Amino acid sequence: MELGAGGVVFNAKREVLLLRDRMGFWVFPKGHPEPGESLEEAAVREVWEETGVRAEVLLPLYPTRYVNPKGVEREVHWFLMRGEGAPRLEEGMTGAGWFSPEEARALLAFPEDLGLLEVALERLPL
Ligand SMILES: Nc1ncnc2c1ncn2[C@@H]1O[C@H](COP(=O)(O)OP(=O)(O)OP(=O)(O)OP(=O)(O)OP(=O)(O)O)[C@@H](O)[C@H]1O
């Protein structure tokens, strides 16, 4: 099992930050933690690296699990964050943007991420 760390980032308009990967799936930004990094610290870094968005962690969510196309099981730990700014795609990505919850529900590729979105919304401060 390979650990991952990422963020469910919202802006002041309560829109969520989504990214479209190389396989064309809309998901949340996440990546591998470096040795010595807390998962929260790694999530903030991955968000910045993959979307060019500076975010601040509000509170922890919960981990999701799945097996990627290469047969590797992943356990990604998520954090609710707040951020602003236009996104920037890093090499590999096929899309990125801010989305209303309604739009996200219609774009997110996986069930694990839909539930994550709803819980994040329940805990997002007004
Ligand atoms: N809930 C889910 N259910 C079923 N399949 C899911 C899924 N989520 C993603 N996939 C499927 O796995 C792929 C991403 O691989 P990943 O294992 O999450 O890993 P990644 O290989 O892109 O690796 P990261 O941890 O994101 O990589 P880094 O950001 O650290 O970049 P690096 O490897 O260059 O350091 C998606 O393209 C989709 O097909």
**Determination method here?**
X-ray
- Tell me, in angstroms, the distance from the centre of ligand 1 to residue 126's CA: 31
Q: Which atom of ligand 1 is nearest to the CA of 110?
A: 1
**Pairing relation of β-strands 26-27 and 16-20?**
antiparallel
What is the rounded CA–CA span in Å between residue 28 and residue 35? 22
Give 41-106 as a DSSP string. HHHHHHHHHHH--EEEEEEEEEEEEEE-TTS-EEEEEEEEEEEES---PPTT--EEEEE-HHHHHH
Provide the 3-class DSSP secondary structure of residue 121: helix
Residue 68 CA, ligand 1 centroid: distance in Å: 6
Which of 95, 112, 86, 125 lies closest to 6, judged by CA? 112
21 is in an annotated binding site: yes
Q: Please indicate if the annotation marks 22 as binding a ligand.
A: yes
Reported resolution, Å: 2.0
Domains annotated for the chain, with CATH where assigned, are 3-124 (3.90.79.10)
